[PDB]
């Protein structure tokens, strides 16, 4: 409603780096909000794409940011008869970035990992990795919960049970308010998907540099399944955290599985122990229900609601049989044990192939009227296909079915304007929460500021 | 007054054989539609599916490791396909294409270094390096070329169960000059697989976020060039390209994914699903049954309909089956001529004093081009 599309602050990154692919806000110890931007295609030390993270301080002019330095050297260690080796080439560092209090969690989902013991090996595969950083203190850590030393033939014997070799941990990530780093790993358990949770303090304390295969004590992983509805579900493609069981002493995980049950798609609510509290099923095959999940209180009743993006949802038209426009499903949480049933509102795209629902950003109370608001991105929407971000204001009965504001892409076509979104935080400190939009195809980040 | 004047009305043909490009399966072929503001005028279209119409059967075969038995059953397909398709058409062209999946981690086995030239290294056998889609045989009427080309095909091996089959469908659809799709012919794309399929946004597990643009990327090497740099297509883009190229996709899928591909074919017009055996041994009768089943249904589709214009159809199927609201007629056979009473309504009087849209059956180049003039 009041996001200003004229005075735009553009942060830019290296060309081809996919700057803006993932972005969060970082509040310094002094409270000065910076923008964490992930660029999974930043060139490393040997001109190889290794990814990077840029800590962009808030300046109303934008421009280039200083990179946040991580170790990008492929490590190799002999621990016993096994050679442990990590591969940072095309690891995608910055494909998801989340910032806790003073920690920046930068995840490299496609970081590969192999274990050589003899003529046998552990099948170099994208186990993923998250790089933790305290930028004000300079302290660095790492968290790869899916690294193992089990060899390939052992997995072939077990019929590939508990196979975390293709996790891609940090594909999606979220830090709970208590400080637990929840990682989505949609390739975990042979592409069934898993969640990896460990406290950030326990990741920083358990991390020894040089040691490649260690175990966080407080680390908790999801469970494997033989139910064929979970096969290739990509559980953990998107993760969120909310309050969906009344007990405000526990944190509920909101996991999107966009190909769950033969590409139908699901979003499961769970507790800290990965027991499925509720499961929301996709409305349409191959619509990618669960591609993005947002947890906001859009109707001001204190109970967190669930917004699920289905960016490949096909609606009914005349000149097009089924028009892939995308859809966002709003699930208002009612006063009850679970009570989460049918979507209380359906936001659908209008541009064909616009991918409406790829990102859903809780904007907080954008216009400060008592109801939290929502930004949904169509990274290829708008009448030109360059990308839109649509601001949906909350009301007493959910959201507004019509966007109060559309933010058209200030970048050329292919920029994927809106692929990453981030709101609810006030960069310029004028009392109104702002929106940070990431166009990784333009390698830029647009900063929309909310007017009074 | 608002009228519907018929400009081109060639009578429907009786046989699709002989001199083609004169075979008219839709009548009329052009209509001038004058509509005063906020008015409605009705016109009629006849859609006959003629007999002995030429067929293009591009066999798009999953060549993952589970399909090494199927290559023994396809080895004489093409001669048997020519013998069985000889009663259904007088001009048959068959082609062959193969897919496995995007040759990139975590779909492709990336270690040991010997598992890149031989993904079957851990199976202790030898297959081809993983490919995403390779065009093998351009649609040709020399049906022994199909046998010659499938006898020299080998499978590859990937890691996960979903395949890159929709990537291959997109490439076999949009590379129409490379595949060999004739204009005046039925375009049967026989998509055989025994596994789930990858869809858009699945390529992000490999680092591939760039959406499928639907362009041709099969070069002179006959391989899909954008397999590792471009995402999988969605059902929307793949359906749009199948509709633009008039291609009747046939899911020849094993019983473990028959329900998945039926739920897909419900979302893709012009598609049928046949149950493939675990060794593709019933694929000839599957193709024949799916050609008879695709031609057992006339479904209309509207292309580039103006926003101010709406359409309503009254499908005049089998003699007394006037079915309102339907732009389809199931339960047909080759030779049945169905009718559709279409009614175009305006919503106001737009700025453009003359627009144009086309009404065609799904899977045919024949169309009714309605030139709509707003006076």
């Amino acid at each position: 409603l009041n996001l200003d599309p004229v005075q735009l602050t553009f942060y830019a990154g290296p060309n081809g780096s996919q700057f803006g692919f993932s972005l969060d806000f970082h509040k310094d110890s002094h409270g000065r909000v910076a923008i964490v931007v992930g660029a999974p295609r930043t060139l490393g030390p040997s001109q190889e794409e290794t990814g990077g993270v840029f800590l962009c301080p808030w300046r109303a002019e934008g421009g280039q940011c200083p990179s946040l330095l991580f170790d990008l050297r492929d490590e190799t260690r002999n621990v016993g008869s096994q050679t442990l080796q990590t591969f940072k080439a095309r690891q995608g560092l910055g494909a998801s970035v989340v910032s806790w209090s003073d920690v920046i969690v930068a995840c490299a989902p496609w970081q590969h990992w192999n274990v050589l013991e003899k003529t046998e090996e552990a099948e170099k595969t994208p186990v993923g990795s998250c790089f933790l950083a305290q930028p004000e203190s300079g302290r660095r850590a790492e968290y790869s919960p899916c690294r193992g030393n089990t060899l390939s033939r052992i997995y072939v014997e077990n019929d590939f049970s508990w196979d975390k070799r293709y996790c891609e941990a940090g594909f999606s990530s979220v830090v709970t308010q208590a400080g637990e780093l929840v990682l989505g790993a949609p390739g975990g358990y042979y592409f069934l998907g898993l969640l990896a949770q460990a406290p950030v303090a326990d990741i920083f304390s358990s991390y020894r540099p040089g040691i490649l295969l260690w175990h966080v004590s407080s680390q908790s992983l999801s469970f494997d399944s033989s139910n064929p509805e979970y096969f290739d579900g990509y559980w953990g493609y998107s993760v969120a955290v909310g309050e969906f069981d009344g007990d405000l002493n526990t944190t509920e995980y909101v996991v999107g599985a966009p190909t769950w049950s033969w590409t139908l798609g699901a979003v499961e609510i769970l507790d800290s122990y990965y027991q499925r509290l509720h499961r929301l099923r996709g409305e349409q095959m191959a619509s990618y229900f669960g591609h993005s999940v947002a947890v906001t209180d859009v109707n001001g009743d204190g109970r967190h609601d669930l917004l699920v993006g289905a960016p490949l949802y096909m609606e009914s038209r005349a000149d097009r049989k089924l028009a892939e426009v995308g859809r966002v499903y709003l699930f208002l949480q009612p006063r009850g044990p679970h009570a989460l049933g049918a979507p209380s509102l359906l936001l659908t795209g209008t541009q064909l192939y616009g991918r409406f629902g790829s990102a859903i950003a809780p904007l907080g109370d954008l216009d400060r009227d008592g109801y939290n608001d929502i930004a949904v991105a169509a990274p290829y929407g708008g009448p030109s296909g360059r990308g839109q971000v649509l601001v949906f204001l909350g009301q007493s009965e959910g959201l507004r079915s019509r966007p109060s504001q559309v933010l058209d892409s200030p970048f050329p076509t292919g920029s994927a304007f809106g692929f990453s979104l981030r709101g609810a935080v006030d960069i310029d400190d004028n009392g109104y929460p702002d929106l940070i939009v990431g166009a990784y195809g333009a390698n830029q980040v647009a900063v929309y500021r909310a007017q009074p | 007054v608002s009228e519907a004047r018929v400009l081109e009305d060639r009578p429907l043909s009786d046989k699709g054989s002989g001199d083609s490009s004169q075979v008219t399966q839709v009548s009329p072929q052009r209509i001038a539609l004058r509509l005063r503001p906020d008015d409605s005028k009705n016109f009629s279209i006849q859609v006959r599916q003629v007999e002995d119409y030429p067929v293009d059967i591009y066999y798009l075969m999953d060549l993952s490791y589970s399909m090494k038995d199927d290559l023994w059953s396809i080895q004489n397909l093409g001669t048997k396909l020519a013998t069985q398709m000889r009663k259904l058409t007088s001009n048959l062209r068959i082609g062959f294409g193969a897919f496995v999946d995007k040759p990139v981690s975590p779909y492709m086995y990336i270690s040991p270094p010997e598992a890149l030239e031989n993904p079957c290294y851990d199976m202790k056998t030898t297959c081809l390096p993983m490919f995403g889609y390779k065009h093998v045989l351009t649609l040709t009427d020399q049906v022994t070329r199909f046998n010659e080309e499938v006898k020299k095909q080998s499978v590859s091996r990937n890691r996960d169960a979903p395949e890159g089959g929709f990537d291959a469908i997109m490439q076999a659809t949009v590379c129409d000059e490379k595949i060999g799709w004739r204009n005046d012919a039925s375009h049967l794309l026989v998509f055989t697989t025994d596994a789930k399929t990858h869809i858009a946004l699945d390529g992000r597990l490999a680092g591939i976020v760039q959406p499928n643009d639907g362009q041709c990327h099969v070069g002179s090497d006959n391989h899909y060039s954008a397999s590792t740099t471009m995402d999988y297509p969605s059902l929307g883009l793949m359906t749009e390209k199948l509709s633009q190229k008039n291609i009747n996709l046939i899911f020849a899928v094993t019983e473990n994914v028959v329900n998945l591909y039926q739920n897909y074919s419900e979302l893709i017009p012009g598609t049928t699903v046949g149950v493939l055996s675990m060794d593709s041994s019933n694929v000839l009768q599957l193709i024949v049954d799916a050609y008879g089943k695709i031609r057992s249904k006339v479904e209309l589709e509207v292309r580039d309909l103006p926003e101010e214009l709406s359409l309503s159809f009254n499908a005049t199927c089998l003699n007394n089956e006037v079915i309102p609201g339907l732009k389809s007629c199931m339960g047909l056979k080759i030779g049945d001529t169905v009718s559709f009473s279409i009614e175009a309504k305006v919503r106001g009087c737009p700025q453009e004093k003359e627009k144009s849209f086309t009404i065609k059956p799904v899977g045919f180049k024949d169309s009714l081009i309605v030139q709509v003039t707003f006076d």
Epitope: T119 | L71, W72, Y121, M123, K124
Partner: antibody
Framework: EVQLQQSGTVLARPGASVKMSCEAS????????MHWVKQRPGQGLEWIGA????????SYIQKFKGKAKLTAVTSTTSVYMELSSLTNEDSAVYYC???????????WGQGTLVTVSA | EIVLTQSPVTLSVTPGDSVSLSCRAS??????LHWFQQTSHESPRLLIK???QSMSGIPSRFSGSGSGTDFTLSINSVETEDFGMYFC?????????FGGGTKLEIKR
């Protein structure tokens, strides 16, 4: 035409070692894995392992790890199997077998009989 | 490994009668089940590949059937050349295993 030609019958003694060959002709030698199968007289067939003549990489059946050892000599296109610490349970017919383009083991050696009587 | 259990262990059939040899896998090996014949005049001879595909040059009396975990080898009219040992073999997972074997006797 893939033909597998093994060595002849070889008498041995317990605790000793026996090396049997398999001359592979009719296909590109280093490309394909060579598989070895054991069949005790009157009993069933038991897979021993495979050898990749390209990089001389070998993978055995856990029952045969340490007992059987596979080596390849790509100059003469021969695969050698060496049984170590022979017992009377090693007196069997050992076949080298190969798969075809359809990945079924249609090509077998005539078999090398081993006798560990002492 | 995938255990292939053949039944019966031995089987007496009159020359000209019909036989049905069974194989049962520990797990799903879809059609990756092959049938070998060994009457000791040569190495094991592959009769039916992929559980239903007769090899070239194999008599038309040998028939394969089955999928998943239960497979069958049927002989229409056993000749004097068919009496021997029949092994089912899986090439689904490595290590590749054989069945216990099934002898065919003449049953006079």
């Amino acid at each position: 035409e893939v033909q597998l030609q093994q060595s002849g019958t070889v008498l041995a003694r317990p605790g000793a070692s026996v090396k049997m060959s398999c001359e592979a002709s009719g296909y590109t030698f280093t490309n394909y894995w060579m598989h070895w199968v054991k069949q005790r007289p009157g009993q069933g067939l038991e897979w021993i392992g495979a050898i990749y003549p390209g990089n001389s990489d070998t993978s055995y059946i856990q029952k045969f790890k340490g007992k059987a050892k596979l080596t390849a000599v790509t100059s003469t296109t021969s695969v050698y199997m060496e049984l170590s610490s022979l017992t009377n349970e090693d007196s069997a017919v050992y076949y080298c077998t190969l798969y075809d383009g359809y990945y079924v083991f249609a090509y077998w050696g005539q078999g090398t009989l081993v006798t560990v009587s002492a | 490994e995938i255990v292939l259990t053949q039944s019966p262990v031995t089987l007496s059939v009159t020359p000209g009668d019909s036989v049905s040899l069974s194989c049962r896998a520990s797990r799903d090996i879809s059609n990756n089940l092959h049938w070998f014949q060994q009457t000791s005049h040569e190495s094991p001879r592959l009769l039916i590949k992929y559980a239903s595909q007769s090899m070239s040059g194999i008599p038309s009396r040998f028939s394969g059937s089955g999928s998943g975990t239960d497979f069958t080898l049927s002989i229409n009219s056993v000749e004097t050349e068919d009496f021997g040992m029949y092994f089912c073999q899986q090439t689904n997972s490595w290590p590749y295993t054989f069945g216990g074997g099934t002898k065919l006797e003449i049953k006079r």
